[PDB]
RNA sequence: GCACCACCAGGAGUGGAGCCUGCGGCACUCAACACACGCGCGCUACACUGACGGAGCCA
């Protein structure tokens, strides 16, 4: 199976956007702002929502995981609060633990780049804002909520067509309103009744997806 | 171009000057949008670009997706400029120009 | 937005005369007057002695549909006391 | 899909939000004398032809 | 009456020239911006003949002493170059405070004038942008021999105050090529 | 949607098992074991420390609780440890989100044998009895998902149940190993993918594979 | 009225590696749980518009 890069536009394909994800540094060697500093927050005047790494770690555990980026059709693109752009190579391993990744996550946000312990190759990449300079030419855009009115996945990505590409747009975050992408999207969707989280949600995109196409 | 215009001479043979001028027309959008601020929240709205940007934007559109395509690949400038040449006097929705006309117009649509 | 006052204008006092016209043969608080053609004319003597033809060479016909029923109220009115013949000649010309 | 010709006969001024909008009075030219307001994008001059995407819709003024 | 002034460099101005370049252009409503394709032009004399214009500034860089500015007033043809003291990184500022139409007063320290007068006419017939003749900033002019230094200073009255403020750049500036000119 | 409990043997749900959890305590203040903070610590005892592992099963926990088949009162969810001690899911329990407070909650959890509220006696953690065909349902189907087992499809096998026969599924918590830890209890072992799924990944995909069958939104 | 720190149109820089020039300073999507150096300008590389060889020829 082909590695997806953003230089193609044709592929038709699915991404993510794990957007307005909660990564700050702090130094004391910078670790990630988090139980480690849950207390040290405001008493060094910093945010709560802001210490939640582990929303967007298990979204990454989750997509990153799936079937259908071993069948090769998915990208991710992760937004942090401040517009921190991210692109991230299908092929890379996520460090299961919380150490190695607060640390593995320094060294992105510091270095701009972590890139192949084999080859020539960039893992994890920083880019340019907007987030539609690299994204394929024909994709229908939406937006995941709870607010949204409920639509299965599997029916809808069955409306695609032959080129038409889809990309989806996560908040990784604590709470809030659901408008970090009012300016991109042609849609609000939404998938349950209930309050939903934001891994459980892209895993009924992904699941949703590989039912839709034909992918076990 | 000397080249270029020898290749859609040879191919479909329609006296080149033809693909050109087709390939100016068939990839303006007739229509766009632009960013209104409105206070805070930037409304797009739907407005109707002037002729001369018309032509402008049909320039720009062709020979910036060509060297896009024609970047690392066996393929030239000139060979890969034909290819968005004849894709784009027939509407085939398969060039590179083609597909950018259609999606401001979708944009345009959804919100006027 | 001084067109935009005319328009609003406009449609408010039509708004109110087709609201008036089935009165009972067939059985808004403020502009401000007891008609809202006495606004109508005085709003056209708010506005400046220069460059307010810039203000109607921007209204499109439907300002004229709704323009000269004004201009019959006033004149089946005979105010002259909120309005003068220069103006109404000086704009309808 | 209804593609419509119109020409401009004579601009009014410079309005909108960014500076690119001219209300410009336009007269289509298939059925003629009726006439319409728009909201135009790029540089235009007098006795120009523009391209109407809906027949039958006005807007004047953007913030 | 008040003059036209044109502002011109070297084809390759870095980022230390340019911003230098924008605060020599706020001396306006009569400062204007332009660099040229080739290096300096012989032809500028048609340039300002055919303009009708008066001065002329040009920023350039020597190796006798270093940087160097020009001022030329041009139908007469007196020439007065001077060197500066620091080029290096001055503030990125293009226009703040007032604008330059605004007439400060103008102040002489050091008074000489024996023969540095010629230069005390010249910055009097230079710095007379706009109709305003009424103070709401000010200018310094500081004589220490054949060393000059150049302020800018807001008014800022409190209680009755005479606060100055300070803006703008700092130059100190010496006496280099001042070139003989003629009644033509 | 009353809450689920293991006294009704009759009422047709989906039963999740986390066999072989990786739970075990230690005194140093009592600490869940695993192979980061206590790696030098599990190599004093004489053990395998790549299997100290509870990260898996706390995003099986997050997993599992957080889709709406939990919320519709259709899922219930039990864990075995690999010592086999045997832990009932209340459904409406919120599992911590981090590592360290969900650790010190199986702290307390494998110490004081029931998790509750001052204001609940219906326990929140429930330490039950061995075998799990006790506390199953009488109509329910046992599997173990493996890669070595044939594929299968999720909605039409899950067609393909009674009317009123359940279904219990066998997750192995754990980073490697056999499919052998429950045969003792299962009817079948299918798979779900030509890949090998981790165990988050298997639960989400007969989650919401399950909610593709009975059409729970 | 006016303006390239007034916006729409676009282009071009720095800001990543190296070298120096000058300058500066020394409560909770989680009841339970757990709470020495620097800055900026120029200068040099990485491009596959690739190499290598000739021949022509303009200030």
Redesign the pocket.
């Known amino acids: 199976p082909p590695v997806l890069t953003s230089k193609d536009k044709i592929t038709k394909r699915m991404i993510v956007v794990l957007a307005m994800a909660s990564l700050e540094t702090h130094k004391i060697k910078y670790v990630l702002l988090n ?1 480690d500093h ?3 927050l405001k008493k060094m005047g910093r945010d ?2 802001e ?2 790494p ?2 967007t770690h ?1 979204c990454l555990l989750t997509l990153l995981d799936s079937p259908i980026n071993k069948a090769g059709k998915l990208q991710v693109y992760i937004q942090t609060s401040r517009g921190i752009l991210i692109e991230v190579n299908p092929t890379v391993r996520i460090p299961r633990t919380f150490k190695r990744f607060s640390g593995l996550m320094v060294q992105l946000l510091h ?2 780049s972590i890139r192949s312990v084999n080859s020539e190759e960039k893992l994890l990449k920083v880019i340019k804002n907007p987030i539609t300079d690299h994204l394929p030419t024909k994709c229908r855009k939406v937006t995941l909520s709870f607010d949204a009115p409920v639509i299965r996945v599997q029916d809808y990505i069955e409306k695609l067509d032959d080129d038409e590409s889809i990309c989806v747009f996560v908040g990784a975050m ?2 809030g309103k659901d408008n970090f992408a009012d300016e991109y999207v042609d849609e609000k969707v939404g998938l349950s009744n209930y ?6 949600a892209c895993s009924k995109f992904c699941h949703g997806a590989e039912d839709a196409w034909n992918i076990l | 171009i000397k080249h270029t215009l020898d290749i859609i001479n040879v191919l479909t043979d329609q006296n080149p000057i033809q693909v050109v001028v087709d390939a100016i027309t068939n990839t303006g959008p007739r229509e766009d949008t ?2 209104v ?1 409105g206070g805070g929240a930037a409304r797009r709205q739907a407005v109707d670009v002037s002729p001369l ?1 018309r032509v ?2 049909a320039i ?1 559109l062709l020979t910036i997706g060509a060297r896009e395509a ?4 066996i393929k ?1 400038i000139a060979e890969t400029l034909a290819e968005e040449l004849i894709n784009a006097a027939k509407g085939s929705s398969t060039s590179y120009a083609i597909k950018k006309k259609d999606e401001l117009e979708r944009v345009a649509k959804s919100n006027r | 937005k001084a067109g935009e006052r005319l328009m609003e204008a406009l449609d408010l006092g039509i708004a109110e005369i087709e609201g008036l016209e089935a009165y009972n043969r067939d059985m808004v608080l403020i502009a401000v007057n007891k008609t809202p053609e006495q606004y109508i004319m005085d709003t056209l003597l708010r506005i400046r002695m220069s460059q307010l033809e810039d203000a109607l060479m921007v209204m499109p016909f439907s300002y004229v549909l709704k323009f000269l029923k004004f201009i019959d109220t006033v004149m089946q009115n005979k105010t002259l006391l909120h309005s003068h013949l220069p103006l109404i000649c000086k704009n309808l010309f | 899909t209804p593609v419509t010709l119109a020409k401009v006969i004579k601009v009014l001024g410079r309005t909108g ?4 909008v001219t209300q410009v009075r336009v007269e289509f030219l298939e059925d003629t004398s009726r006439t319409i307001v728009r909201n135009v ?2 540089p235009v001059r007098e006795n120009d032809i523009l391209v109407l995407m809906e027949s039958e819709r006005e807007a004047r003024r953007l913030r | 009456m008040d003059p036209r002034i044109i502002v011109t460099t070297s084809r ?1 101005p ?3 020239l340019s911003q230098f370049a ?1 605060e020599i252009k706020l001396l ?2 009569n400062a204007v ?1 332009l660099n040229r394709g080739n290096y300096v032009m012989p032809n500028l004399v048609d340039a300002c003949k055919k303009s009708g214009t008066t001065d002329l500034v040009v920023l350039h860089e020597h190796r006798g002493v270093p940087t160097s500015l020009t001022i030329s007033h041009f139908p007469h043809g007196p020439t007065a170059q001077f060197s500066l003291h ?1 080029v ?2 001055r503030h ?5 405070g007032n ?1 330059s139409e605004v007439n400060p007063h103008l102040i002489f320290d050091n008074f000489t004038t024996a023969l540095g007068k010629r230069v005390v006419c010249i910055l009097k017939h230079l710095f007379n942008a706009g109709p305003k003749k009424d103070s709401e900033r000010v200018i310094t002019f500081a004589n220490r021999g054949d060393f000059i230094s150049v302020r800018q200073h807001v008014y800022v009255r409190t209680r009755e105050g005479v606060e100055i403020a300070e803006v703008g750049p700092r130059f100190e500036m010496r006496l280099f090529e001042l070139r003989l000119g003629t009644l033509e």
């Open positions: 139980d849950q207390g040290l709560i929502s210490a939640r582990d929303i298990q270095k701009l604590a709470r309050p939903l989280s934001a891994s459980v | 632009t960013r601020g940007r402008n934007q720009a024609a970047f690392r690949n030239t | 939000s960014r500076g690119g994008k790029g | 390759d870095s980022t230390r924008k306006f409503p911006r620091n290096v990184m990125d500022i293009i226009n703040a604008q």
